[PDB]
Design a protein around this ligand. Structure first.
Ligand SMILES: CCCNC(=O)c1ccnc2[nH]c(O)nc12
Length: 167
């Protein structure tokens, strides 16, 4: 038993809700919240900009130190950093950005990072400003993640299309 509430169960291990991931994080305080990161951990907009704003820019300060030490992530890769006031940990995962021409096959590799964590609160990778089809992203999630994932979808209209079209 865990503290996530109001989710629709899609599969044995995947759940979905219309929610603001920032507000969901602050209420649940999950062990892991997933950020829709880029390789530079520049949290300017989308999910990343919202999460970072909710940390009063502490996420960005921590991220800049991480990059200065380690260099950029790989597309499809991830790193674990602090969850600040939102979660114990933040798993920064880089899905491919179609608006940068990155290969969509890397979306499966991105979701594989979730399997290193027993339970996660997460957005749909590569959705939103990353330019992928969220219906495809949900399919890859279901077919790749084996751990327990709670998907927050900000847009109510999108949440309903994802549910109604789910196979
Ligand atoms: C709506 C298209 C892309 N989706 C997001 O950007 C997103 C998802 C979940 N929670 C969020 N909170 C926030 O500000 N944006 C989001």
């Amino acid at each position: 038993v865990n503290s996530f509430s109001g989710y629709l169960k899609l599969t044995d291990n995947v759940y979905i809700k219309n929610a603001d991931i920032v507000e969901e994080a602050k209420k649940v305080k999950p062990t892991v919240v997933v950020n829709a990161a880029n390789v530079y951990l520049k949290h300017g907009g989308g999910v990343a900009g919202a999460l970072n704003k909710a940390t009063n820019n502490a996420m960005q300060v921590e991220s800049d130190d991480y990059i200065a030490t380690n260099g950029p992530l790989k597309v499809g890769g991830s790193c674990v950093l602090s969850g600040h006031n939102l979660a114990k940990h933040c798993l920064h995962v880089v899905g491919p950005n179609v608006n940068k021409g990155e290969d969509i096959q890397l979306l499966k590799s991105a979701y594989e990072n979730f399997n290193q964590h027993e339970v996660l609160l997460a957005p749909l990778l590569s959705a939103g400003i990353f330019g992928a089809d969220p219906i495809h992203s949900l399919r890859v999630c279901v077919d790749t993640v084996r751990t327990n994932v709670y998907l927050a979808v900000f847009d109510k209209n999108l949440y309903d299309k994802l549910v109604s079209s789910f196979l």
